[PDB]
Design a protein around this ligand. Structure first.
Ligand code: FMN
Ligand code: FMN
Ligand code: UQ1
Lengths: 192, 205
């Protein structure tokens, strides 16, 4: 199983979402020694936002006739999509930032949801892929049945976006109160 | 009554959310010649993302003791927050990108939600908003249909509903949403309706 790990926290050593994700990846590597891991940093690296140029090229009515300039505008997107195609398991580590994800992760999603590549018209085009979302939160009760579940626009939105392109087998492991981390940690070891 | 307009679409003349928002601002201008209008571009301008240095600065236990480097890391945030404090009405124009907002608008939000400035907390964490007496108008454009209340795809909409939650957290709980749908394809009717709604809001604000 080939893995694509997308880290969304701008923090490095201090990132809990990053740490917990690495705990899973390490535990998984031991259980599957032949596994490959590709890491795509979107937290500590400023992934470019969608531009009007991107929109013109991505939604170009006839893709084959794109100019070299248009292809250049889509070069990063193609690289990012390719990493996704080449993977079997998608691991996303992300904090909750203002009831959603950090802007860098939104930028990544906006690059890999591509007409005619990951979706068409609406139907998904990705198949046989699973996702694991490892998230960290300062507050409490954003999970299923929580007092503040309706305010959660982070992982539940990722489900929607990922589901739209065909990734419908998604698991979310969440730590709150920043004991919950230990539960998350142990949970992740079992999954690996 | 002072207005802050935040445009989130990367498109210019062809941005429908920008166009509709400008219809409101112009109509408002006609009814209030003395009113001040400030524009903050987050769509055609790449707003910096929250970094680790920003987190270290914004959550510093003794904010008075921040080094000049730390203050530099917060200089943009301080400017963005200030524009908001100076405003009575906030106008956000935004597309729906992949069931949420463009990353640039998310970045703007992440800059203006600030500990001890736009929100605070005490330990008993019990959060408190610090903005008062302000209102917001969200003008949005969508390619598909049914993302509004009662719509078939309502549960998929993580854009304007999410903006409501984030804005409410810092104290802006009076929020109006004007949406146009079917841009991908009727749309002329949706736009005309949104226009009439905005012209009415402008005349009465
Ligand atoms: C800019 C910013 C926004 C945040 N917004 C929320 C939030 O909306 N809800 C919440 O529960 N925690 C919020 N937090 C707290 C973080 O989610 C929490 O500290 C988390 O552990 C960070 O994960 P990390 O260690 O991987 O960086 C926020 C933190 C920052 C820096
Ligand atoms: C990257 C991208 C993602 C989009 N995602 C959605 C979507 O999830 N749902 C939808 O109804 N329309 C979606 N659209 C269509 C836009 O919402 C629509 O074209 C809108 O009018 C753009 O706003 P603007 O005219 O202000 O630029 C998307 C468009 C782009 C370019
Ligand atoms: C920095 O910004 C924010 C936090 O920082 C720690 C939070 O914990 C939270 C969590 C709030 C709840 C209701 C527990 C929010 C919402 C937030 O915006």
């Amino acid at each position: 199983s080939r893995i694509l790990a997308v880290h969304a926290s701008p923090r490095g050593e201090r990132s809990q979402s990053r740490r917990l994700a690495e705990v899973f990846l390490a535990a998984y590597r031991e259980a599957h020694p032949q596994a490959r891991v590709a890491r795509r940093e979107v937290g500590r690296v400023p992934l470019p936002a969608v531009t009007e140029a991107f929109v013109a090229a991505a939604f170009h009515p006839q893709p084959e006739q794109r100019s070299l300039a248009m292809q250049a505008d889509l070069a990063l997107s193609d690289q990012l999509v390719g990493e996704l195609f080449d993977s079997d398991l998608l691991v996303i580590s992300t904090p909750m930032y203002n009831f959603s994800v950090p802007s860098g992760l939104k930028a990544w999603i906006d690059q890999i949801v591509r007409l005619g590549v990951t979706f068409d018209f609406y139907r998904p085009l990705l198949r046989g892929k699973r996702a694991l979302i490892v998230t960290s939160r300062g507050g409490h009760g954003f999970g299923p049945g929580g007092e503040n579940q309706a305010m959660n626009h982070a992982d539940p939105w990722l489900r929607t976006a990922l589901g739209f392109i065909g990734i419908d087998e998604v698991t979310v492991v969440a730590a709150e109160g920043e004991d919950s981390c230990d539960e998350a940690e142990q949970r992740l070891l079992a999954l690996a």
